[PDB]
């Protein structure tokens, strides 16, 4: 991560956040937790890298 980026996708369905357009991680270290959350929403937290 960084270098060649991540690409995270909530495809149509239930948005990760907002637009749900694929959110891309160029952050070098990163750790991902997103849950399916009742407002059809997948919340991942501020690119915590550790």
């Amino acid at each position: 991560w960084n270098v060649n980026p991540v690409t995270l996708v909530a495809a149509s369905g239930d948005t990760i956040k907002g637009s749900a357009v694929p959110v891309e991680i160029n952050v070098r270290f990163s750790d991902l937790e997103l849950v399916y959350c009742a407002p059809g929403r997948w919340e991942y937290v501020k690119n915590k890298q550790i």
Binding site: E43, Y44, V45, K46, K48
Partner: protein, 50 residues
């Protein structure tokens, strides 16, 4: 729900437009408690001498 840590606790600053002349001192420096002697910034918009 991403959570954040910050700076301002470990970095803060305050700047004075001078009036009335006089004003040879500045009290409390920044509002409360203690300034720390070891690191000093006085700026005339030139950064005043050590």
């Amino acid at each position: 729900d991403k959570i954040t840590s910050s700076d301002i606790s470990n970095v803060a600053r305050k700047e004075f437009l001078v009036e009335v002349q006089g004003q040879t001192d500045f009290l409390d420096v920044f509002r409360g408690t203690s300034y720390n002697v070891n690191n000093i910034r006085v700026k005339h918009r030139g950064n005043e001498l050590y």
